Short mmCIF file of C-alpha atoms and ligand atoms in Angstrom, two decimals:
data_model
loop_
_atom_site.label_atom_id
_atom_site.label_comp_id
_atom_site.label_asym_id
_atom_site.label_seq_id
_atom_site.Cartn_x
_atom_site.Cartn_y
_atom_site.Cartn_z
CA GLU A 1 139.38 80.06 128.69
CA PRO A 2 141.61 80.17 125.63
CA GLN A 3 139.03 81.00 122.69
CA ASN A 4 139.03 77.87 120.32
CA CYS A 5 140.25 79.13 116.92
CA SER A 6 143.88 80.21 117.79
CA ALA A 7 146.68 77.52 117.47
CA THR A 8 149.65 77.04 115.21
CA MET B 1 143.35 75.98 111.70
CA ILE B 2 143.75 79.52 112.89
CA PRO B 3 142.02 82.62 111.24
CA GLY B 4 144.79 83.09 108.49
CA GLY B 5 147.17 80.35 108.74
CA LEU B 6 147.73 77.92 105.76
CA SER B 7 145.49 74.99 105.25
CA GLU B 8 146.56 71.56 105.92
CA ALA B 9 147.99 69.99 102.81
CA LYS B 10 146.29 68.12 100.19
CA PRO B 11 147.07 66.54 96.87
CA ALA B 12 147.92 68.58 93.88
CA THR B 13 144.89 68.94 91.73
CA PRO B 14 144.50 69.91 87.86
CA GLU B 15 143.79 73.56 89.01
CA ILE B 16 147.05 73.72 90.87
CA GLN B 17 149.18 72.32 87.88
CA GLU B 18 147.47 75.10 85.67
CA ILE B 19 148.71 77.47 88.37
CA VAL B 20 152.30 75.94 87.98
CA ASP B 21 152.52 75.67 84.52
CA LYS B 22 150.73 79.41 83.92
CA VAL B 23 153.58 80.18 86.50
CA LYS B 24 156.54 78.22 85.20
CA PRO B 25 157.85 81.21 83.06
CA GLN B 26 157.98 83.57 86.09
CA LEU B 27 160.39 80.79 88.25
CA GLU B 28 162.79 81.00 84.73
CA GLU B 29 162.52 84.91 84.52
CA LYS B 30 163.93 84.97 88.12
CA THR B 31 166.29 82.18 88.23
CA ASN B 32 166.94 82.28 84.63
CA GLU B 33 166.86 78.38 84.46
CA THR B 34 164.57 76.15 82.25
CA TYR B 35 163.20 73.23 83.92
CA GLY B 36 161.55 70.24 82.14
CA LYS B 37 158.01 69.08 83.36
CA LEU B 38 157.52 70.71 86.72
CA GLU B 39 154.59 68.35 88.23
CA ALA B 40 152.31 69.34 91.10
CA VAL B 41 152.49 67.18 93.95
CA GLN B 42 150.80 69.05 96.87
CA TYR B 43 149.78 72.47 97.90
CA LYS B 44 148.17 74.62 100.80
CA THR B 45 145.91 77.67 100.83
CA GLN B 46 145.82 80.89 102.82
CA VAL B 47 143.21 83.51 102.31
CA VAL B 48 144.23 87.05 102.48
CA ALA B 49 143.12 89.90 100.16
CA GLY B 50 143.00 86.84 97.60
CA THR B 51 144.45 83.53 98.21
CA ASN B 52 148.16 82.69 98.31
CA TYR B 53 149.32 79.58 97.34
CA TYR B 54 152.03 77.03 98.58
CA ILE B 55 152.81 74.44 95.86
CA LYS B 56 155.27 71.35 96.20
CA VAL B 57 156.17 70.85 92.27
CA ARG B 58 158.30 68.27 91.38
CA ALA B 59 160.41 70.07 88.55
CA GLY B 60 163.32 67.69 88.06
CA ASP B 61 162.88 63.84 88.84
CA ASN B 62 163.92 63.41 92.37
CA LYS B 63 163.86 67.08 93.49
CA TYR B 64 161.16 69.03 94.68
CA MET B 65 160.52 72.78 94.56
CA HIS B 66 158.18 74.94 96.34
CA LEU B 67 156.60 77.64 94.87
CA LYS B 68 154.14 80.55 96.60
CA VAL B 69 151.69 82.21 94.00
CA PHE B 70 149.09 84.98 94.62
CA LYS B 71 145.94 84.67 93.20
CA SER B 72 143.94 88.00 93.26
CA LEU B 73 140.34 88.46 94.06
CA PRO B 74 137.68 88.04 91.31
CA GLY B 75 137.17 91.68 91.06
CA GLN B 76 140.60 93.61 91.38
CA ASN B 77 141.63 91.98 87.97
CA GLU B 78 145.16 90.70 87.07
CA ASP B 79 146.70 87.14 87.07
CA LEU B 80 148.80 84.57 89.44
CA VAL B 81 152.15 86.10 90.64
CA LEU B 82 154.74 84.06 91.68
CA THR B 83 155.29 85.71 95.09
CA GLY B 84 158.41 83.50 96.46
CA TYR B 85 160.06 80.01 95.80
CA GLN B 86 162.28 77.51 97.76
CA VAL B 87 164.89 75.49 96.00
CA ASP B 88 166.07 72.10 96.78
CA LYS B 89 163.02 70.44 98.68
CA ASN B 90 162.51 66.89 99.82
CA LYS B 91 159.47 65.13 98.79
CA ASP B 92 158.22 64.66 102.30
CA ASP B 93 159.16 68.24 103.22
CA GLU B 94 156.29 70.00 104.80
CA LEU B 95 155.08 72.88 103.06
CA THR B 96 155.32 76.33 105.01
CA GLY B 97 154.50 79.99 104.84
CA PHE B 98 157.11 82.65 103.44
CA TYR C 1 117.60 93.92 121.14
CA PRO C 2 116.18 95.88 118.09
CA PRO C 3 115.43 93.69 114.82
CA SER C 4 118.07 95.92 113.21
CA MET C 5 121.35 97.57 114.20
CA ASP C 6 123.69 99.33 112.40
CA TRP C 7 127.03 100.51 114.39
CA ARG C 8 127.96 102.80 111.22
CA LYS C 9 124.73 104.58 111.07
CA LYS C 10 124.48 105.36 115.05
CA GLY C 11 127.32 107.72 114.91
CA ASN C 12 130.87 108.18 113.58
CA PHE C 13 131.97 104.70 115.06
CA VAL C 14 133.46 102.58 112.19
CA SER C 15 136.77 103.27 110.60
CA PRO C 16 137.25 103.50 107.11
CA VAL C 17 137.59 99.93 105.03
CA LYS C 18 141.12 98.77 104.20
CA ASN C 19 142.86 95.77 102.98
CA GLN C 20 145.61 93.28 104.28
CA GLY C 21 147.08 92.52 100.91
CA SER C 22 148.82 89.12 100.23
CA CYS C 23 149.43 89.26 104.26
CA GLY C 24 147.11 87.02 106.41
CA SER C 25 146.70 89.95 108.67
CA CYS C 26 142.94 89.77 108.47
CA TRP C 27 142.66 89.18 112.79
CA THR C 28 144.70 92.27 113.15
CA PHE C 29 142.41 94.28 110.77
CA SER C 30 139.53 92.22 112.76
CA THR C 31 141.32 93.59 115.87
CA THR C 32 142.07 97.11 115.05
CA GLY C 33 138.14 97.74 113.96
CA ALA C 34 136.58 96.49 117.39
CA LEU C 35 138.93 98.74 119.12
CA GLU C 36 138.69 101.65 117.01
CA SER C 37 135.20 101.52 117.30
CA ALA C 38 134.89 101.21 120.95
CA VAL C 39 137.07 104.10 121.66
CA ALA C 40 134.91 105.92 119.32
CA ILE C 41 132.11 104.56 120.76
CA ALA C 42 133.31 105.93 124.33
CA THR C 43 134.98 108.84 123.23
CA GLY C 44 133.86 110.25 120.30
CA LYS C 45 137.51 110.43 118.89
CA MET C 46 138.12 108.61 115.66
CA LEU C 47 141.53 106.90 115.44
CA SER C 48 143.21 104.48 113.15
CA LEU C 49 145.43 101.87 114.98
CA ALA C 50 148.29 100.14 113.39
CA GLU C 51 147.90 96.53 112.49
CA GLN C 52 151.63 96.51 111.67
CA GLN C 53 152.25 96.23 115.69
CA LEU C 54 150.17 93.23 116.07
CA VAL C 55 152.13 91.69 113.17
CA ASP C 56 155.35 92.46 114.35
CA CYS C 57 154.46 91.84 118.31
CA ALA C 58 151.50 89.62 119.38
CA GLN C 59 153.55 86.73 119.30
CA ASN C 60 153.48 85.75 122.85
CA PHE C 61 149.57 85.39 122.38
CA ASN C 62 149.46 82.68 120.09
CA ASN C 63 149.39 85.04 117.11
CA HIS C 64 151.79 84.39 114.14
CA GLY C 65 152.04 87.50 112.02
CA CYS C 66 151.13 87.52 107.98
CA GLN C 67 150.58 83.41 108.92
CA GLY C 68 147.42 83.38 111.35
CA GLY C 69 146.05 85.01 114.54
CA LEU C 70 142.78 85.65 116.37
CA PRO C 71 141.11 88.83 117.76
CA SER C 72 140.86 87.49 121.20
CA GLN C 73 144.40 86.61 121.79
CA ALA C 74 145.60 90.03 120.31
CA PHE C 75 143.16 91.69 122.73
CA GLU C 76 144.92 90.17 125.79
CA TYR C 77 148.26 91.43 123.92
CA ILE C 78 147.35 94.92 123.72
CA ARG C 79 146.07 94.46 127.44
CA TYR C 80 149.12 93.08 128.61
CA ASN C 81 151.60 95.24 126.01
CA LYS C 82 150.07 98.50 127.56
CA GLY C 83 148.28 99.63 124.21
CA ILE C 84 148.74 99.85 120.32
CA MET C 85 149.89 102.87 118.46
CA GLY C 86 148.26 104.06 115.22
CA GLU C 87 149.43 104.06 111.58
CA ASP C 88 151.23 107.50 111.18
CA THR C 89 153.84 106.21 113.36
CA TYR C 90 153.54 102.33 112.64
CA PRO C 91 152.55 102.08 109.04
CA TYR C 92 151.32 99.13 107.14
CA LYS C 93 153.69 96.86 105.38
CA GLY C 94 152.21 93.49 104.94
CA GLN C 95 155.06 91.35 106.30
CA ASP C 96 156.67 90.08 108.96
CA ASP C 97 158.97 92.71 110.59
CA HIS C 98 160.44 92.97 113.90
CA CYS C 99 158.65 94.74 116.96
CA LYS C 100 158.92 98.49 116.70
CA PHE C 101 156.56 98.91 119.79
CA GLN C 102 157.28 102.26 121.57
CA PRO C 103 155.35 102.64 124.61
CA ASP C 104 155.09 106.43 124.70
CA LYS C 105 153.12 106.07 121.30
CA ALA C 106 150.10 103.94 122.02
CA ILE C 107 147.08 105.84 121.59
CA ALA C 108 144.27 103.26 122.26
CA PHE C 109 144.27 100.71 125.33
CA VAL C 110 142.16 97.86 126.47
CA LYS C 111 140.92 96.83 129.82
CA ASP C 112 138.68 93.68 129.42
CA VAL C 113 138.09 91.11 126.73
CA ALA C 114 134.46 90.09 126.47
CA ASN C 115 134.50 86.47 124.35
CA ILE C 116 131.18 85.52 123.26
CA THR C 117 130.63 81.99 124.25
CA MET C 118 131.55 79.17 121.56
CA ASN C 119 128.88 78.64 119.06
CA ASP C 120 126.37 81.42 120.67
CA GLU C 121 125.30 83.71 117.65
CA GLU C 122 122.69 85.02 120.10
CA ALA C 123 125.27 86.49 122.50
CA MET C 124 126.82 87.98 119.56
CA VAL C 125 123.57 90.05 118.70
CA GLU C 126 123.42 91.10 122.11
CA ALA C 127 126.95 92.33 122.28
CA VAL C 128 126.46 94.08 119.02
CA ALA C 129 123.09 95.82 119.95
CA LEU C 130 123.96 97.05 123.67
CA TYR C 131 127.87 97.44 123.10
CA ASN C 132 130.41 97.11 120.08
CA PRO C 133 130.73 95.77 116.71
CA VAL C 134 132.26 92.20 117.42
CA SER C 135 135.26 90.44 115.71
CA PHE C 136 134.77 86.82 114.34
CA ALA C 137 136.19 84.59 112.13
CA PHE C 138 134.15 82.59 109.68
CA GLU C 139 134.91 79.71 107.14
CA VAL C 140 135.84 81.23 103.68
CA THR C 141 135.56 79.50 100.29
CA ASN C 142 136.42 80.52 96.61
CA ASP C 143 132.42 80.74 96.69
CA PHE C 144 132.88 83.86 99.16
CA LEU C 145 135.41 85.36 97.04
CA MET C 146 133.01 86.20 94.39
CA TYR C 147 130.43 87.92 96.49
CA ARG C 148 129.22 91.42 95.30
CA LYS C 149 126.11 92.04 97.35
CA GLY C 150 123.09 90.74 99.00
CA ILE C 151 122.98 88.10 102.09
CA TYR C 152 125.60 85.47 101.53
CA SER C 153 124.31 82.05 102.23
CA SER C 154 126.26 78.94 101.99
CA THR C 155 125.84 75.07 101.52
CA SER C 156 129.69 74.36 101.13
CA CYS C 157 131.26 75.47 104.42
CA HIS C 158 130.87 73.37 107.19
CA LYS C 159 130.43 74.94 110.69
CA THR C 160 133.15 73.67 113.34
CA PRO C 161 136.51 75.06 114.48
CA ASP C 162 138.64 73.51 111.95
CA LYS C 163 137.88 75.40 108.68
CA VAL C 164 137.40 78.77 110.47
CA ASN C 165 139.89 80.92 108.61
CA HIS C 166 138.89 84.35 108.12
CA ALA C 167 138.25 87.02 110.83
CA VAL C 168 136.42 90.45 110.23
CA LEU C 169 134.20 92.65 111.98
CA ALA C 170 130.22 92.42 112.77
CA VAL C 171 129.06 95.88 112.59
CA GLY C 172 125.32 95.26 112.52
CA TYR C 173 122.44 92.86 111.95
CA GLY C 174 119.06 93.27 110.26
CA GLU C 175 116.55 91.20 108.02
CA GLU C 176 115.47 91.78 104.30
CA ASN C 177 112.95 89.89 102.50
CA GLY C 178 111.93 87.68 105.73
CA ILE C 179 116.13 86.84 105.97
CA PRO C 180 117.96 87.88 108.90
CA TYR C 181 121.65 88.84 108.33
CA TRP C 182 125.02 90.25 109.73
CA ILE C 183 126.35 93.61 108.16
CA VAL C 184 130.45 92.99 107.99
CA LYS C 185 133.29 95.02 107.61
CA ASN C 186 135.86 93.29 105.82
CA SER C 187 139.67 93.85 105.45
CA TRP C 188 139.94 93.90 101.58
CA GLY C 189 139.16 97.36 100.33
CA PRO C 190 136.76 99.51 99.11
CA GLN C 191 136.29 97.62 95.96
CA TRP C 192 135.29 94.01 96.93
CA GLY C 193 131.57 93.22 97.90
CA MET C 194 129.58 96.06 99.12
CA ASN C 195 132.50 98.35 99.56
CA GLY C 196 134.57 96.02 101.90
CA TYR C 197 131.26 95.18 103.61
CA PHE C 198 129.26 92.09 102.75
CA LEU C 199 126.06 90.77 104.37
CA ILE C 200 125.83 87.24 105.71
CA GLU C 201 123.10 84.73 106.68
CA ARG C 202 122.34 85.29 110.33
CA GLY C 203 120.62 82.86 112.70
CA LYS C 204 122.33 79.69 111.87
CA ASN C 205 126.14 79.98 112.52
CA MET C 206 126.48 80.32 108.81
CA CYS C 207 130.15 79.06 108.29
CA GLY C 208 131.23 78.88 111.67
CA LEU C 209 129.88 82.46 112.48
CA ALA C 210 130.34 82.35 116.19
CA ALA C 211 132.94 79.63 116.83
CA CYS C 212 135.59 82.52 118.29
CA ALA C 213 133.87 85.90 118.47
CA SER C 214 134.99 88.80 120.79
CA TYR C 215 135.17 92.44 121.40
CA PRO C 216 137.07 94.66 123.33
CA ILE C 217 136.64 96.85 126.36
CA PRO C 218 138.69 100.20 126.35
CA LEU C 219 140.60 101.68 129.01
CA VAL C 220 139.24 105.23 128.43
C1 LIG D 1 139.51 85.29 125.95
O1 LIG D 1 140.02 84.63 124.95
C2 LIG D 1 141.46 84.96 124.86
C3 LIG D 1 142.26 84.40 124.00
O2 LIG D 1 142.29 83.05 124.14
C4 LIG D 1 142.11 84.47 126.53
O3 LIG D 1 143.59 85.14 126.71
C5 LIG D 1 144.27 84.78 127.54
O4 LIG D 1 144.12 85.24 128.69
C6 LIG D 1 145.05 85.16 129.75
C7 LIG D 1 144.63 85.89 131.01
O5 LIG D 1 143.24 85.63 131.16
C8 LIG D 1 146.75 85.49 129.22
O6 LIG D 1 147.48 85.06 130.26
C9 LIG D 1 148.34 86.07 130.56
O7 LIG D 1 149.55 85.78 129.44
C10 LIG D 1 150.54 86.81 129.54
C11 LIG D 1 151.63 86.21 128.54
O8 LIG D 1 152.42 85.21 128.84
C12 LIG D 1 151.24 87.15 131.01
O9 LIG D 1 151.38 88.50 130.79
C13 LIG D 1 149.96 86.99 132.05
O10 LIG D 1 150.96 86.17 132.84
C14 LIG D 1 149.11 86.03 131.72
O11 LIG D 1 149.35 84.41 132.05
C15 LIG D 1 146.96 84.54 128.06
O12 LIG D 1 148.02 85.02 127.47
C16 LIG D 1 145.82 84.74 127.06
N1 LIG D 1 146.05 83.88 125.69
C17 LIG D 1 145.93 84.09 124.60
C18 LIG D 1 146.12 83.29 123.71
O13 LIG D 1 145.63 85.37 124.52
C19 LIG D 1 141.37 84.62 127.50
O14 LIG D 1 141.83 84.04 128.72
C20 LIG D 1 139.87 84.40 127.29
N2 LIG D 1 139.05 84.86 128.56
C21 LIG D 1 138.07 83.84 128.95
C22 LIG D 1 137.09 84.38 130.00
O15 LIG D 1 138.06 82.75 128.31
#
């Protein structure tokens, strides 16, 4: 799914 | 945090103030002004081929400034260079990139 | 999977070390590296990809120019955007510009994105042993900044998603003196560490070493 590290 | 964002913000620490104090002359060479005591209040960090500092300095009384300094890697020599600054900043104002 | 693995040794599969300056575009260097390697691993043609592009345009994939990003999302960016051009046509500037993407210029492409499962360091080793240099993001500290040589261990860094703050490229692995490590390419120039490269403690998810790692599958 969307890799969790990228946000902001 | 994203791999390159600025960190969440933390209270200013004694080293931040060192950085601001070591840096104060550069604000002045650029704005040709003379500030009283510039007190560090908050800062954020960002890893690059060094570290970029995003500090919230109280340089007046009820007026805040936002400096941006770049501290080099421990092997490439050189000192803290004021890469940018934002005039007229509220105390609550979120520190941001630039 | 062999105990050792150096993608740089197998052949001409790792592009020169380079730095990102004061711009937080490490993820783009993480990104460009995985893809230059793959195409190299598949075609033997060595190419350098423009990180500026990812800086100026990978916006719709949750990236944020010189203020942050992540290889996985950027990998998606190149699939959907139909490619990435090199540098000679999209040179590095280290600052947020506006998109100058030009289709007829793209010289490298992406078909699939293989996202290593979260916290699965072992799978990362698999991907590196059989397939391609992997891109990951760990947790840097002023501690790490002084690195000069040897296997970088760390007790100050936590592992979890949050403090993960610096994407790089796992290009190999091994063990010395009984300590298993990761060979890594960094984006700070041929002066820092072991000529841009640094070794880091392997086997314990050192500084959230495998919280968000992935590699590309080039369309060639
Ligand atoms: C692997 O990790 C990446 C990074 O999070 C994931 O990327 C996401 O991939 C989806 C499709 O699988 C992308 O959706 C597409 O969005 C574009 C742009 O709006 C559009 O052209 C398409 O209609 C499609 O919806 C999504 O943008 C992308 N997200 C990011 C942040 O890159 C990917 O899903 C992960 N794969 C797995 C199996 O977990």
